[PDB]
């Protein structure tokens, strides 16, 4: 529902999702063949499912096609410094794709907003929802569209008949947290092909034994996982598949 929804949010107030007490697989997010750009700093894009962390912070907002290069640590501009700042120790993983047939319509879709003016810089990972008129001059104006007072929040120009570098791009960033806590959301070895009657090596959560897997004729009680024998040897392990 974060990826596929009826509508999205803006950049001054974006959607914040926390992934806790869950398990996921990042293999279906790589073989989709539908994303435009894919950058993943701090960790390799194909070896991030084995190493897993504490928490996953995912933020979702919309951005134009010419500003997708601004979501990176170590540059200055207009959007990456007034709406969402990227720190130096940024191990996030950004995913962007084009869905111009849903977030735009004929006549002018101006439902999403952005902030243009700001007094000073802001700390990264901080949301700014201030709707105050940024004063440019030295005199107070008391909320009027007069001189030396301009509104920081301005509208977009999304049109579905545009080119490539100015279309509404759905951009999401997946950041990880590293604290003194055990692994919660994690990627565990998935599920390989089941083979039998060969000299194989398996690791069923309690042991690493090398041998064969013959079909037994005894059914176990539905509360055990392993099985010993007379000679005190674990030679019967229930397959969790």
């Amino acid at each position, epitope marked *: *529902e974060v990826f596929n929804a009826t509508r999205f*949010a803006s950049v001054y107030a974006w959607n*914040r999702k926390r992934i806790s007490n869950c398990v996921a697989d990042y293999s279906v997010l790589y073989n989709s063949a539908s994303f435009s750009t894919f950058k993943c700093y701090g960790v390799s894009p194909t070896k991030l499912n084995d190493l897993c962390f504490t928490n996953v912070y995912a933020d979702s907002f919309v951005i134009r096609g010419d500003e997708v290069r601004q979501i990176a640590p170590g540059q200055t501009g207009k959007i990456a410094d007034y709406n969402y700042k990227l720190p130096d120790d940024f191990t996030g993983c950004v995913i962007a794709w084009n869905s111009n047939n849903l977030d735009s319509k004929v006549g002018g879709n*101006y*439902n999403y907003l952005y902030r243009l003016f700001r007094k000073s810089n802001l700390k990264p990972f901080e949301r700014d929802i201030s709707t105050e*008129i940024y004063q440019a001059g030295s005199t107070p104006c008391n*909320g009027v569209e007069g001189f030396n007072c301009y509104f920081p929040l301005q509208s977009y120009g999304f049109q579905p008949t545009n080119g490539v570098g100015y279309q509404p791009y759905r951009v999401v960033v997946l950041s990880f947290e590293l604290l003194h806590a055990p692994a919660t959301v994690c990627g565990p070895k998935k599920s390989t092909n089941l083979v039998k009657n060969k000299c194989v090596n398996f690791n069923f959560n309690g042991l690493t034994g090398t041998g064969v897997l013959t079909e037994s004729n005894k059914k176990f009680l539905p509360f055990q996982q392993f099985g010993r024998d007379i000679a005190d040897t674990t030679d019967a392990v229930r397959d969790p598949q």
Partner: antibody
Amino acid sequence: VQLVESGAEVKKPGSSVKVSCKASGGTFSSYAISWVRQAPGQGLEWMGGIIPILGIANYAQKFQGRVTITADKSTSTAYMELSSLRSEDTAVYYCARENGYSGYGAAANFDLWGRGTLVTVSS
Amino acid sequence: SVLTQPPSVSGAPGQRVTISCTGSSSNIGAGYDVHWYQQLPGTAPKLLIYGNSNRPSGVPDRFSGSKSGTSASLAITGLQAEDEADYYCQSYDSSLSGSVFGGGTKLTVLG
């Protein structure tokens, strides 16, 4: 400042309601204005919020396309239009004001409220 | 909906009475600030405390708001003759794309 709303109003089950939101003084053409409802029996819901400067609508996903809120800059008033009324529309609406700030939370708060419009509908 | 609240709470006029608001990990536990309101039966609700760190003008300092992880708490000291209203917990939810209120607790003496 203070926001003045209309009094009681009754209509038909399937007709349109036309209420307004008056503002006394200023500080109305600079901040966002939303509409918060309240019904006896359940909690408080939130229909949507309208910015008066750019005139951009921002509703919720729980409410479908049946209510439209407009704004005016000449007299600094807001109107509410809602048609195809149902049997659970017997509630009261409030004309609220939003004042954003900065911080890690950055949540929308309602510092200034209105008076109230009792809109009940039945046979 | 996503925010639940106790239906009623008992207290004594002179002790500390605390209340809690429990939701999900995407509206209150994600990092958004909470806002508490008072619904008096007969007038419009006003603002009591925003962000659980600042104090608006016109409110007493007896109200204390805090956020313990995924849940928010409101503690008061002393029951006066104006606490016959309902308390709601309001937080910005991303799954609903807007602000959603709580259930509401009644705290009025029988007398």
